[PDB]
Design a binder for these strands. Structure first.
Lengths: 493, 548, 99, 778, 25
RNA sequence: UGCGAAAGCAGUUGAAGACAAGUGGCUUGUCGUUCGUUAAAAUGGCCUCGUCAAACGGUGGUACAGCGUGUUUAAUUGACAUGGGUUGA
C-alpha cells in the first residue's frame, strides 16, 4: 500500500512576463526610506571590511549611516566648501573625502573629530578620491585640473605620481583588481585612459574610446572594465583593448555604476546602473549584461550603491538623487535535575553499530477541501471551495478535482437557493478568466440542468442568471474580437 | 555517390596574393607562375622536373630539379640562401618543410636519410624501406608513407625517425594513390572503373569500391571523405563522395591532367601559365543532403514487380484475410504483352484496348487493390493511348484510379468531357495546382467549383496555395468575390485564402463594402444556427372532485 | 527603455483619434515592442483586453508594411499569438454556455 | 546465424476456474517458511521472503521432462492446479515439492539445488474429470474433480492411496455434488462449503472431507433477509463465501456489497456493511475471530468480529480478488490483485505481506502490457453495474459469448502494444493505463511502477458508477537516444454528461532521471501540443547530432510537425521548429524518420512521403533540379518509413512493402503484405509490428490465426528478417503463439513480446565430521 | 516507503506551457 | 456494432426453454439457460506510524499559491516527558 497522492493545484500554461528568480530576489528589497538631504547626493561608498556602514556625500558634510538602523551614526561636517567624494580604505579603517577647494582630507572612519591628514591637492575642485584596492598606503585623487595624482599617505607633501594626459575634466578613477600597477581613469572627453604606474605615468599605455563623456568607470573582472557615460554603458576587455558589450537601455545619461560578486543571490554577479531619469537597473554580467530588474525613483538619480559581497546581515540598496534626497531599500534576514533525568534525548547514534530510521517525514498540512475530498465529503468540499479567503487557483483546483474525480451532480444534489448563490456568485468572477471558464461553463450548465425549477421559484437567483448572461455576452464579444485580431494578423504573414 | 557535377607553391593561399603557386611546366624551360604579381627567379633550374613546391614562404621558393638536391630562390627581395647537396640523381619532386615538421633527404632511389628543414641539419639514415614507387607525406604524426612496387607498404614518421608500421601491400601500377582528405586513408584508383580506400596506418584495404565511369585526374579534396576527378580526354571535373567546421569552397588542390588545369579552385579561370576559363562554384562535401543530388555510381534499374514471401509449405496458411481469393496469379509477361495487344488498329474503338486492359487486370474497372503493376508499364500504356487513340470507357477510368500516373495530367482542362473531367478532379492522385487554380478561376459556376476547391484545399499546404495564387490577375479575383457574394464551407476558407493572398493595399472600395456586408450577415446566420445546434409543490388549500 | 510607469500613463489615453495618429507618428522599428507590451498586459490583466486591443488593431493597420517585411512575425510577437489563441480557443464552449 | 529463444517469464497464472471463490492462490510458503513457491505460465518461481529475490526458477520449457506435458501450438488448458510441500511418494522425509496439474500428472520436483533430470512423476487413473484441487491433512489425501441442465458444473471427491505399485495412485470416491455454483475450502483444508441450485432457488452445503465429522445443508433463503426479495438481484447474488477452521461460522459475501456471518449451528446471521461495491474475497483467520475482505475498492479490510471493528489497508494497486491468512500464527496475508485499469488483459499481482506492520513483503508480478484488444477468454470480473472496467451481474455469459464471436468472426484482430527499451540500462517500459511498469528482463522482475498522468488513479478505489471514468491513456513514450529524457504523450479523457465531455485533452510530458534513481521527474509538460483537440500520431526522438540527442519531433494527423528541444539557458524543453499545413483531411496513418546525419526528415503522411530538410524545415529543394524527387505517392497510406541507414529506407503500407534508395534514387525492392496483413491491424501499428537494427537488417513479422477442418482462437507467428535492403530472408522463424511487439535492443538483438507475456529474443574422519557437523548444527 | 507501493504523480515545479508560445524560431 | 479523424458516416433491439409473482391456462417479469445477429439504490466509502514554529531554494500567481531541502542544479533548523488524572460545554 502507498501513501495518498496530494491534490495537485491546477497550473495553467504560463502567461508571458512571469516572475524570474532574479526579479524575485531583487523585488524583495523593500521598505523604502526617504531621507531629505540639504543638497544633491553626489557620491555614496560602503565600508568594505565589516561591510555594514555607508558614507553618503551630500553638500558640505559626509554622513555614515548604519546598515541595521539606517540612521546617521556619525557625520563629518567640518568641510569649507562642497565635499565631493568620500570613500573608505580597503581595510575600512579610514575615510578620504575630496572637497571643492582641492583639499583631500582623510579622517579615520567612526571618529569625525580626528582629521588624520589634509592633502592639499590642486587649487581646482577635487572630484574623486579613493584609496588603492590592493595597496593600503596610496590614495588616488583626480580633480578639475585634468590630472590625477597618486599620493603616498606617509609623504603627503608632493604626490608620488602625477598621471596627466587627459584633455578635459577627469571625473573617475578605477583600479584593476588583480594587477596593482594599473589605474584606469575617465574624463569628460570620452577616452578612458589607463596607466602603468611603473612607467613614466604622463602617458597612458592605451585609451578606450567611449564616445560620450564618461561618468564612471568600474572594473568587473581583472580583465574587463565597464564605463558609463551618455545613454549607454560599454564593457571593455582589457587584455585585448577591445569593446565587447554595450547596453543603452536608458533615456538620459548613466551617472554611476557598481558591481557585486559571490553574494547570496541567483545572480552570481550584478552590475547596477543609475541614470539621471529616475531609473536604477541591474544587469547580469553572465548572460551578456542583460537587464533583470529595475527601480524607478521620484527624480533624477545621481549615485547608487549596494551592500558589499560579504554583508552577512541586513542588505541594502541605496540611491541618492539629484533632488536632494536619499532612498534606501533593504532586504532583511528546565532544571538540572530534570535534565539529568531526561539526559539522552539529543544523541542521534554516533558510536552505535546499527542505526534504524523509520520516523516518517511530516508533510504539509491538508486544507479543508483536500481532507474533505479525502473523506469523500464532496458537497462539503464544494462548500469549502466557496469560502471568501480562498485562492482563485484553489477554488479552481477543487472544482477540477470534483469534475475529474466524481460527480458535479453529487456535489450539487442537496442544494437550494441559499446554498447555490456562493457557486454562481463565484462563477460571475470566474467566467472572465480563460483558465477557469471551461470549468465555470460546465458547472453552470449542470446546475441549470438540475435546478431549472428553483429558477422559477426563487427570483433572487434569476437576477444572478441574468448577470451571468450579460457576463457571457461580454466574454463572447471578447472571444469573437480576439478571433478577428487573429485573422487580421494571419493576413500579415 | 557523386556531388554537384558541373564544369565540363603554397597550398593554403588564394587570390589577392601575388604568386603563392610557382610550378614546373611540361615542354618548357623549367617553371612559371602568374597572378590575378610575384617574381619568377631560379631555384637552380634546367633539369628534369615533374612538380614544384616551396617552403610556404614564396621568397624562399625553389625549382625542384632532378639533380638529387635543391637550393633556394629570391622571388621578392634579391638575397639568396645557401644550400648543400645530398644526392645527385633525381630530386624533381622536392617539398621543403615548415619549422621542423616533415623533411628527409629522399630523392628518388631509396635513400630516405632523415634531416630537418635546414641546409646543414641532419638526423638518422632512415633508408631502410625498399624501392617505393609511391612515397607521400601526411600529417598523422608527420610521416612518409611509402608504397613499394617490390610490393609492400611501410610508414615511417619523421618526428623521431621512427618506423611506425609496415606490411605487404600488393599494389599494382596505379593511377593516383593520393592520401585521404583527413589523411587517415589512401585513395588509390584502379585504371578504368575503380577507386579503393586502404587503411594508411596499417597498410591494408578498408573499402575497395568501383567508380562511376572513366576518370583519370583524381585527387582527394579538402573535404571529409570526398574526391574530385577530371576526365582523361575531358575538361569535365566531376566530384564524388564516398573541413568539418567551416569547409573549403575553392583553392583546395592542384593536381590535374586536363588541358593545363593548374591551380584548381572553384572559379579556376586565371591559371598560372595557362589562362583558361572557369567552372562550378560549390563548396566541399556536406553531411547527407547533397548525396540526393549526386546520386551517381549506380545506374542499374530493372522492372521491379511485387514479389511474395516464399512458399515453404504455404498450404497451411491458416485463414487468409482476403474476401474470397488467396493470391493473385501474377502475369508480368502478360503485362508486357498487353502493350503489344493494345498498340494496334483500335484507333478510335474500345474493342482491342479497353477490353485488353480489363482482361489483363480482372477488376471492377474503377478500383485499385487487385494490383500487380509497374509505373513504367502504366506510363507506357498511357503513352500508347495518348498516341494514335480519352474515348475509352474502361482503361482511362480505371487508371486515374491508380496512385502512379506521373505528370501526364496537364491537358485535363484541355479536354472537357463532364463525367471524365469530374472523375479526374476527384480521383486523379497527382494534380498540378496551376491547372487547379486555372480551372477554379475559369468559373463555369457549378458544383465542380466545390469539387475543385475541395481538392485544392485537401492536398496542398496553405502557404504553397498562397504563393502560387499570387499568380493571378484582378478580374479573376473580382469576379470570384462577385460570384461568392451572389451564390460552402471550403469556399469560405478559400475566400479567406484569396483575401490573404491578394495583398495589403491595392484593392477597391465598393467590392470591399459589398463583401463586408455579405460576411456580416454570414456571421449573423452562422451565429444563430450555431445557437440552434447548441440548443438541440403543494398549496395550503385546494378544491377538487371525486366520484359520487 | 522599459518604463512601465509612463507606459501606463501614455496608454491610459483612450481617445481613438489620439491613438490613431500617435501610432501613425510612431517609428515603425518599435511598433513590434509596443505590440509586445500590449500583448503581455492583456495576457496578464484580462479586463484590459477591451481598451488595449484598440491599440493593437491600430498598430497592425498603420505599420502594415514593417511587420510584413519582418522575417519571423510569429516568432517576434509570439505573446500576442498565444494570448489571442487562448482567448478565442474557448469560443464554442461559451457559445454552448450562453445557448 | 540468427536463433530464436524465449528467455523471460510471463504471467503468474493462478487457478483460472469459475466456481472457486477464496482459494485460487496456488502459491505456497515453505514449512520452514523462508521461501515462497509460486507457479508461472512458463516456470515455477521460488522467491525468498527474507531477501525478496528469486533464488531458483524451474523452467518448464528448459527440458522435455515437463515441456512434453505442454509445448503445444494450440492447447494450453493443461494447467498447474496445486503444489504440495511434502513428498507423496515416500513419507517422513522435505525440501522438494509435488505438483498436481489439472489433467492428472503428478510431478515430484526438487527445488533445492539443480533440478533432477528425471522427476518422480506419475499419472493418476482418472476419468474425463479435470482436477479442481487436491487436499492434505494429517496423513491422508483427497482430490476433487469437475464434470460435464443449465451449464453448471458437477463435483466429485476422491481419496488417494499409493503404496502397492509405485506408478499409480488409487482413488476411492467419497461423494458427489451434482450442481455447484460456488465453492470454498477452509484454511486447514478440513472442510468445504459450496452452493447447489436445487429447487425454488440455490442452496448451501458444508461438508467435512477428511472425516464424516459434519455435513449440513440448508436453502440460502433462510440466510437471506426479507428485504432482499423485493430488491435488486445484486442483493441476493453471492460472489464470495468462506468458512473457518471449526465450521461454526460462515461468511457469505454478496454482490450488493454486504457480508453476512451465519452461525452454522443455528443459522443466525450477522451483517457487515462496509463494501460499497461487490465483495470479491473473504477469508477467516485461524482462530476465526478476524475476517479479511476485499472488493472493488482497492482496500483490504480486516474485521475484528468481536467488536465489528475494521482495520484498513487502502491503496493496493489492484482489486483484491483473493485474500487469505497464511502462517501458522497468521503472520502473513497473501493477496491477488487484479489491476483492472486495462480491460484488455487479466493481469494479476501476487502480494503477500507481513501482518505485523502490513508492509508488502515479496510482491510478485509478471510484465503488464496493455494490448489494443481483449485477448483470449478474458472476462473482466463481476461487479454491481456494467461498466467499462467491469460487467454487471447479468452480462458475464453474454459478454464471453460476444467475445468468442468477436475473435471468431471479426476482422480487426489486432491486439498489439508498444513497449520501449531504456537505451542506458536495457530494461523495458510497458506503459500501463496512466502509468508505466519499468521491468528488466534479465531477471524478469519489475523494477518499479509509476503514475505519469493526473487522474484518480491512485487516490481512490473507484466503485459502481465511478468505474465508468477512465484515467488518461499513455499512448506514446520514447526515450531520447542517450537515455536521459523520456517523452510521453497522453490523452486525458473527460467525464461524461457535461459540456466538455466531447473534447479530449492532449498532454506531452518530458521526464528526467539520473542513472541512479528509479523514478522520473517531470521537468515540463505542454498541454495541447499542435493545437487544441488535435492528437499526436507519432513522436520520434532525435539522433545525436541535433541538440546532442535532446530533441523530439511530434507529428499530427494534419501532417503538422513540431520540433521540440531542450536548451539549457531557459532551463526547459521548449518549442524550436514548426511546419504546420492546414488541410481539411485528417489521417492517423502518419510515420516519421530522420537521417542519422541530422539533415533531412522523412515525413510519411498518408499516401505521401514528404522529404523535409532540417535547416529551413520545409520541403527539400535544390535549385539545380537534379531530379529532386521529394514526394513518393504510394498505392496506400503508409505506416512505416523506417530508414535502415543513410542510403535507403523501407516503407511499409497496407498492400505492399517497398524499399527506396537515395544514393540511387528509385525503388529497389518490393514485397506483398495484403495476403497477410490486410485489414487486421489498426492503421499506425505496423510501426510497432516491424522494426530495424542500426547495422544488421530489418525485421518483418506476420500473424496467422489458425483454422479448423472457420478461424479459431489459436494463433501462430511468422517472423522474418532481412539483411541489407530486403536482400535475403536469412531468418524465417515460427513461434507457437501470437506476437505483439518486436524491437531492437541496442546491442544487436531483437526482443519480442508474446501475447501471453513471454519476452523472447532473436539473436546472433574429518570429512565425515564436517558433513555430520553441518547436519547436527543446522 | 514500501517496495510494492507505486510512485504517485507529482508535478512539482514543472513548467506548464501551451503549444502556442512561438517564442523560438 | 463496423468504418473512421479527434467530427461523423451505415446497422439495430430476435427465438427457444425454465422459474417467480399475479389472476391447468392467461398476463407480466426474471435467468451464475441455450441458439442466432458484425451488435440506481441492504445507511453501505479508503489505516496507523509526531505535531507545531521559523527559515531557505526553485515554480506559478510578495503579503498569495505550490513543490522541495533523506540528496539535489539548488536549498532546513529548532521546540516538546508525542504519557496519566480532574474539570472542561
Amino acid at each position: 500500500s502507498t501513501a495518498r497522492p496530494r491534490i495537485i493545484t491546477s497550473k495553467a500554461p504560463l502567461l508571458p512576463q512571469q516572475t524570474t528568480p532574479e526579479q524575485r530576489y531583487w523585488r524583495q528589497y523593500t521598505s523604502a526610506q526617504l531621507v531629505k538631504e540639504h543638497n544633491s547626493v553626489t557620491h555614496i561608498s560602503f565600508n568594505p571590511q565589516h561591510p555594514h556602514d555607508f558614507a553618503v556625500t551630500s553638500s558640505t558634510r559626509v554622513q555614515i549611516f548604519s546598515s541595521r538602523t539606517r540612521q546617521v551614526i556619525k557625520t563629518f561636517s567640518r568641510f569649507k566648501d562642497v565635499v565631493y567624494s568620500a570613500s573608505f580604505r580597503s581595510d575600512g579603517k579610514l575615510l578620504c573625502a575630496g572637497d571643492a577647494t582641492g583639499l583631500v582630507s582623510v579622517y579615520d572612519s567612526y571618529n569625525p573629530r580626528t582629521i588624520l591628514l589634509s592633502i592639499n591637492a590642486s587649487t581646482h575642485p577635487t572630484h574623486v578620491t579613493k584609496f588603492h584596492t590592493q595597496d593600503n598606503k596610496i590614495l588616488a585623487t583626480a580633480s578639475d585640473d585634468r590630472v590625477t595624482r597618486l599620493w603616498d599617505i606617509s609623504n603627503a607633501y608632493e604626490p608620488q605620481l602625477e598621471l596627466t594626459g587627459a584633455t578635459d575634466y577627469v571625473r573617475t578613477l578605477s583600479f584593476i583588481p588583480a594587477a596593482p600597477h594599473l589605474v584606469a581613469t575617465g574624463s569628460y572627453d570620452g577616452l578612458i585612459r589607463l596607466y602603468d604606474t611603473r612607467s613614466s605615468g604622463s602617458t597612458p599605455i592605451y585609451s578606450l574610446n567611449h564616445d560620450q563623456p564618461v561618468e564612471n568607470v568600474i572594473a568587473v573582472s581583472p580583465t574587463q572594465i565597464v564605463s558609463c557615460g551618455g545613454n549607454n554603458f560599454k564593457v571593455w576587455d582589457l587584455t585585448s583593448n577591445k569593446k565587447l558589450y554595450e547596453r543603452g537601455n536608458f533615456n538620459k545619461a548613466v551617472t554611476c555604476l557598481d558591481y557585486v560578486e559571490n553574494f547570496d543571490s541567483p545572480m552570481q554577479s550584478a552590475l547596477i546602473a543609475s541614470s539621471l531619469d529616475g531609473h536604477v537597473k541591474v544587469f547580469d554580467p553572465l548572460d551578456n549584461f542583460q537587464v533583470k530588474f529595475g527601480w524607478k525613483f521620484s527624480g533624477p538619480v545621481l549615485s547608487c550603491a549596494v551592500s558589499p559581497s560579504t554583508a552577512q546581515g541586513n542588505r541594502h540598496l541605496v540611491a541618492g538623487l539629484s533632488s536632494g534626497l536619499l532612498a534606501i531599500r533593504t532586504k532583511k534576514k528546565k532544571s538540572n535535575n530534570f535534565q539529568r533525568m531526561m539526559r539522552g534525548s539529543e544523541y542521534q547514534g554516533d558510536q552505535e553499530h546499527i542505526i534504524h530510521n523509520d520516523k516518517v517525514r511530516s508533510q504539509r498540512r491538508m486544507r479543508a477541501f483536500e481532507r474533505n475530498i479525502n473523506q469523500f465529503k464532496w458537497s462539503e468540499a464544494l462548500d469549502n471551495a466557496f469560502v471568501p479567503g480562498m485562492a482563485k487557483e484553489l477554488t479552481l483546483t477543487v472544482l477540477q478535482e470534483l469534475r475529474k474525480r466524481g460527480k458535479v451532480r453529487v456535489a450539487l444534489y442537496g442544494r437550494d437557493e441559499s446554498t447555490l448563490e456562493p457557486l454562481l456568485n463565484w462563477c460571475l468572477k470566474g467566467i472572465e478568466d480563460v483558465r477557469s471558464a471551461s470549468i465555470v461553463a460546465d458547472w453552470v450548465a449542470v446546475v441549470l440542468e438540475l435546478y431549472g425549477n428553483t429558477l422559477e421559484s426563487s427570483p433572487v437567483l434569476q437576477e444572478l442568471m441574468i448577470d451571468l448572461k450579460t457576463k457571457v455576452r461580454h466574454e463572447i464579444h471578447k472571444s469573437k474580437e480576439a478571433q478577428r485580431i487573429e485573422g487580421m494578423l494571419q493576413l500579415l504573414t | 555517390d557523386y556531388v554537384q557535377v558541373a564544369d565540363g607553391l603554397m597550398v593554403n593561399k588564394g587570390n589577392y596574393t601575388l604568386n603563392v603557386i610557382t610550378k614546373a611546366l611540361e615542354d618548357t624551360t623549367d617553371t612559371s607562375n602568374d597572378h590575378l604579381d610575384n617574381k619568377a627567379y631560379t631555384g637552380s633550374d634546367e633539369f628534369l622536373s615533374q612538380y614544384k613546391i616551396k617552403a610556404k614562404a614564396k621568397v624562399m621558393s625553389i625549382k625542384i630539379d632532378t639533380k638529387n638536391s635543391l637550393v633556394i630562390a629570391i622571388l621578392q627581395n634579391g638575397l639568396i640562401e645557401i644550400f648543400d647537396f645530398k644526392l645527385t640523381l633525381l630530386h624533381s619532386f622536392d617539398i621543403s618543410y615548415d619549422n621542423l615538421k616533415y623533411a628527409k633527404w629522399f630523392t628518388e632511389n631509396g635513400t630516405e636519410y632523415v634531416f630537418v628543414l635546414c641546409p646543414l641539419q641532419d638526423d638518422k639514415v632512415c633508408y631502410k624501406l625498399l624501392e617505393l614507387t609511391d612515397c607521400g607525406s601526411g600529417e598523422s604524426s608527420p610521416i612518409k608513407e611509402l608504397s613499394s612496387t617490390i610490393i609492400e607498404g611501410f610508414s615511417f614518421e619523421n618526428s623521431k625517425l621512427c618506423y611506425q608500421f609496415g606490411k605487404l601491400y600488393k599494389l599494382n601500377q596505379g593511377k593516383i594513390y593520393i592520401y585521404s582528405l583527413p589523411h587517415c586513408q589512401l585513395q588509390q584508383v584502379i585504371e578504368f572503373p575503380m577507386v579503393d580506400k586502404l587503411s594508411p596506418g596499417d597498410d591494408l584495404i578498408s573499402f575497395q569500391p568501383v567508380s562511376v565511369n572513366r576518370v583519370l585526374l583524381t585527387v582527394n579534396n579538402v573535404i571529409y571523405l570526398l574526391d574530385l576527378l577530371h576526365c582523361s580526354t575531358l575538361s569535365q571535373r566531376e566530384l564524388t563522395h564516398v573541413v568539418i567546421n567551416s569547409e573549403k569552397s575553392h583553392n583546395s588542390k592542384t593536381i590535374a591532367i586536363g588541358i593545363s588545369t593548374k591551380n584548381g579552385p572553384n572559379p579556376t579561370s586565371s591559371l598560372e601559365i595557362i589562362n583558361i576559363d572557369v567552372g562550378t562554384n560549390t563548396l566541399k562535401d556536406s553531411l547527407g543532403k547533397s548525396f540526393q543530388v549526386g546520386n551517381n555510381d549506380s545506374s542499374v534499374i530493372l522492372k521491379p514487380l511485387f514479389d511474395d514471401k516464399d512458399i515453404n509449405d504455404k498450404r497451411v496458411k491458416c485463414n487468409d484475410v482476403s474476401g474470397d481469393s488467396s493470391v493473385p496469379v501474377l502475369h508480368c509477361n502478360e503485362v508486357i504483352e498487353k502493350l503489344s495487344a493494345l498498340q494496334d488498329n483500335d484507333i478510335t474503338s474500345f474493342d482491342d484496348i479497353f477490353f485488353k486492359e480489363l482482361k489483363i487486370k480482372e477488376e471492377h474497372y474503377t478500383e485499385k487493390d487487385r494490383y500487380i503493376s509497374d509505373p513504367g508499364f502504366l506510363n507506357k500504356v498511357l503513352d500508347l493511348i495518348f498516341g494514335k487513340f480519352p474515348k475509352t470507357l474502361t482503361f482511362l477510368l480505371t487508371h486515374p484510379l491508380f496512385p502512379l500516373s506521373r505528370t501526364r495530367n496537364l491537358l485535363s482542362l484541355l479536354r472537357d468531357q463532364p463525367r471524365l473531367f469530374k472523375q479526374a478532379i476527384v480521383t486523379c492522385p497527382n494534380l498540378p495546382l496551376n491547372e487547379l487554380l486555372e480551372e477554379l478561376f475559369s468559373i463555369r459556376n457549378r458544383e465542380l467549383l466545390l469539387d475543385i476547391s475541395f481538392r485544392i484545399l485537401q492536398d496542398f499546404t496553405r502557404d504553397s496555395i498562397k504563393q502560387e495564387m499570387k499568380k493571378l490577375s484582378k478580374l479573376d479575383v473580382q469576379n470570384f468575390i462577385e460570384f461568392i457574394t451572389s451564390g460552402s464551407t471550403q469556399l469560405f476558407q478559400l475566400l479567406s485564402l484569396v483575401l490573404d493572398s491578394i495583398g495589403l493595399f491595392s484593392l477597391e472600395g465598393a467590392l470591399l463594402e459589398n463583401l463586408t456586408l455579405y460576411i456580416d450577415k454570414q456571421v449573423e446566420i452562422a451565429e444563430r444556427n450555431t445557437e440552434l445546434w447548441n440548443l438541440i409543490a403543494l398549496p395550503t388549500y385546494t378544491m377538487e372532485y371525486l366520484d359520487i | 527603455s522599459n518604463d512601465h510607469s509612463l507606459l501606463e500613463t501614455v496608454l491610459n489615453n483612450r481617445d481613438e483619434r489620439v491613438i490613431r495618429d500617435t501610432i501613425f507618428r510612431l517609428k515603425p522599428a518599435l511598433a513590434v515592442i509596443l505590440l509586445e507590451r500590449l500583448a503581455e498586459r492583456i495576457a496578464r490583466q484580462t479586463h484590459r483586453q477591451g481598451p488595449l486591443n484598440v491599440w493593437v488593431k491600430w498598430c497592425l493597420i498603420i505599420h502594415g508594411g514593417y511587420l510584413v517585411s519582418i522575417p519571423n512575425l510569429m516568432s517576434t510577437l509570439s505573446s500576442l499569438h498565444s494570448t489571442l489563441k487562448r482567448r478565442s480557443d474557448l469560443l464554442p464552449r461559451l457559445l454552448a454556455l450562453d445557448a | 546465424q540468427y536463433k530464436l529463444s524465449v528467455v523471460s517469464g510471463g504471467k503468474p497464472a493462478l487457478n483460472n476456474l469459475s466456481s472457486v471463490t477464496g482459494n485460487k492462490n496456488i502459491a505456497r510458503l515453505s514449512q520452514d517458511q523462508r521461501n515462497y513457491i509460486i507457479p508461472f505460465n512458463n516456470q515455477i518461481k521460488v522467491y525468498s521472503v527474507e531477501t525478496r529475490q528469486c533464488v531458483k526458477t524451474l523452467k518448464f520449457a528448459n527440458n522435455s521432462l515437463l515441456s512434453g506435458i505442454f509445448l503445444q501450438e494450440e492447447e494450453n488448458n493443461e494447467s498447474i492446479v496445486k503444489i504440495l510441500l511434502g513428498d507423496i511418494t515416500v513419507p517422513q522425509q522435505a525440501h522438494l515439492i509435488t505438483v498436481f496439474t489439472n489433467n492428472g500428472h503428478v510431478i515430484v520436483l526438487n527445488y533445492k539445488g539443480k533440478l533432477v533430470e528425471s522427476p518422480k512423476h506419475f499419472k493418476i487413473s482418472l476419468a474425463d474429470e479435470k482436477l479442481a484441487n487436491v487436499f492434505h491433512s494429517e496423513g491422508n489425501y483427497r482430490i476433487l474433480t469437475t464434470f460435464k441442465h443449465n451449464s453448471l458444473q458437477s463435483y466429485r471427491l476422491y481419496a488417494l492411496t499409493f503404496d502397492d505399485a509405485k506408478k499409480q495412485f488409487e482413488v476411492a470416491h467419497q461423494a458427489e455434488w451434482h450442481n455447484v455454483i460456488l465453492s470454498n475450502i477452509s484454511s486447514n483444508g478440513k472442510l468445504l462449503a459450496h452452493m447447489c441450485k436445487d429447487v425454488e432457488h440455490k442452496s448451501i452445503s458444508v461438508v467435512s472431507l477428511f472425516d464424516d465429522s459434519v455435513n449440513l445443508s440448508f436453502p440460502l433463503g433462510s440466510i437471506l433477509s426479507s428485504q432482499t426479495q423485493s430488491l435488486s438481484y445484486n442483493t441476493r447474488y453471492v460472489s464470495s463465501m468462506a468458512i473457518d477452521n471449526m465450521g461454526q461460522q460462515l461468511a457469505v459475501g454478496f454482490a450488493s456489497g454486504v457480508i453476512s456471518i451465519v452461525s452454522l449451528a443455528d443459522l443466525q446471521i450477522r451483517l457487515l456493511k462496509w463494501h460499497i461495491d461487490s465483495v470479491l474475497s473473504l477469508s477467516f483467520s485461524h482462530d476465526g475471530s478476524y475476517l479479511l475482505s476485499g472488493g472493488w475498492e482497492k482496500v483490504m479490510s480486516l474485521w475484528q468480529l468481536e467488536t465489528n471493528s475494521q482495520q484498513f489497508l487502502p491503496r493496493l494497486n489492484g482489486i483484491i480478488i483473493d485474500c487469505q491468512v497464511l502462517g501458522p500464527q497468521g503472520n502473513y496475508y497473501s493477496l491477488i490483485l487484479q489491476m483492472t485499469e486495462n480491460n484488455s488483459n487479466s493481469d494479476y499481482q501476487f502480494l503477500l505481506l507481513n501482518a505485523s506492520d502490513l508492509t508488502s513483503k515479496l510482491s510478485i508480478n509478471g510484465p503488464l502490457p496493455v494490448f489494443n484488444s481483449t485477448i483470449k477468454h478474458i472476462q473482466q470480473p463481476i461487479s454491481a453495474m456494467n461498466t467499462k472496467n467491469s460487467n454487471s451481474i447479468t452480462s458475464l455469459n453474454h459478454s464471453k459469448k460476444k467475445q468468442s464471436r468477436k475473435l471468431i468472426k471479426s476482422r480487426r484482430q489486432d491486439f498489439t502494444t508498444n513497449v520501449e527499451i531504456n537505451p542506458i540500462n536495457k530494461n523495458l517500459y510497458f506503459p500501463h493505463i496512466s502509468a508505466v511498469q519499468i521491468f528488466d528482463f534479465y531477471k524478469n522482475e519489475q523494477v518499479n511502477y509509476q503514475y505519469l498522468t493526473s487522474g484518480v488513479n491512485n487516490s481512490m478505489g473507484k466503485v459502481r458508477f465511478e468505474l465508468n471514468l477512465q484515467d488518461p491513456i499513455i499512448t506514446d513514450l520514447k526515450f531520447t537516444k542517450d537515455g536521459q529524457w523520456m517523452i510521453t504523450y497522453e490523452i486525458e479523457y473527460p467525464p461524461n454528461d457535461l459540456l466538455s465531455s466531447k473534447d479530449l485533452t492532449h498532454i506531452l510530458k518530458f521526464w528526467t532521471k539520473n542513472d541512479n534513481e528509479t523514478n522520473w521527474n517531470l521537468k515540463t509538460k505542454v498541454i495541447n501540443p499542435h493545437g487544441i483537440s488535435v492528437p499526436i500520431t507519432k513522436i520520434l526522438p532525435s539522433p545525436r547530432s541535433v541538440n546532442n540527442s535532446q530533441g523530439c519531433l511530434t507529428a499530427d494527423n494534419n501532417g503538422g510537425l513540431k520540433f521540440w528541444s531542450f536548451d539549457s539557458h531557459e532551463s526547459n524543453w521548449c518549442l524550436k521548429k514548426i511546419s504546420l499545413p492546414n488541410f481539411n483531411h485528417f489521417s492517423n496513418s502518419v510515420s516519421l524518420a530522420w537521417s542519422q546525419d541530422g539533415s533531412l526528415i522523412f515525413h510519411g503522411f498518408d499516401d505521401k512521403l514528404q522529404i523535409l530538410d532540417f535547416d529551413t524545415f520545409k520541403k527539400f529543394e535544390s535549385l539545380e533540379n537534379t531530379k529532386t524527387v521529394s514526394e513518393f505517392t504510394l498505392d496506400s497510406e503508409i505506416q512505416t518509413v523506417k530508414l535502415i541507414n543513410d542510403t535507403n529506407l523501407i516503407v511499409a503500407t497496407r498492400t505492399t512493402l517497398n524499399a527506396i534508395n537515395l544514393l540511387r534514387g528509385q525503388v529497389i525492392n518490393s514485397f506483398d503484405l495484403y495476403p497477410f496483413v490486410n485489414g487486421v491491424y489498426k492503421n499506425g501499428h505496423m510501426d510497432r509490428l516491424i522494426t530495424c537494427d542500426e547495422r544488421t537488417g530489418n525485421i518483418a513479422l506476420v500473424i496467422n490465426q489458425q483454422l479448423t477442418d472457420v478461424p479459431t482462437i489459436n494463433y501462430k507467428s511468422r517472423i522474418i528478417i532481412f539483411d541489407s535492403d530486403l536482400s535475403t530472408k536469412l531468418g524465417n522463424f515460427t513461434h507457437h503463439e501470437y506476437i505483439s511487439w518486436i524491437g531492437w535492443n541496442y546491442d544487436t538483438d531483437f526482443i519480442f513480446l508474446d501475447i501471453e507475456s513471454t519476452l523472447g529474443v532473436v539473436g546472433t574422519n574429518s570429512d565425515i565430521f564436517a558433513e555430520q557437523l553441518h547436519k547436527l548444527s543446522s | 516507503k514500501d517496495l510494492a507501493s507505486a510512485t504517485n504523480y507529482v508535478e512539482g515545479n514543472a513548467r506548464v506551457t501551451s503549444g502556442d508560445n512561438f517564442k523560438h524560431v
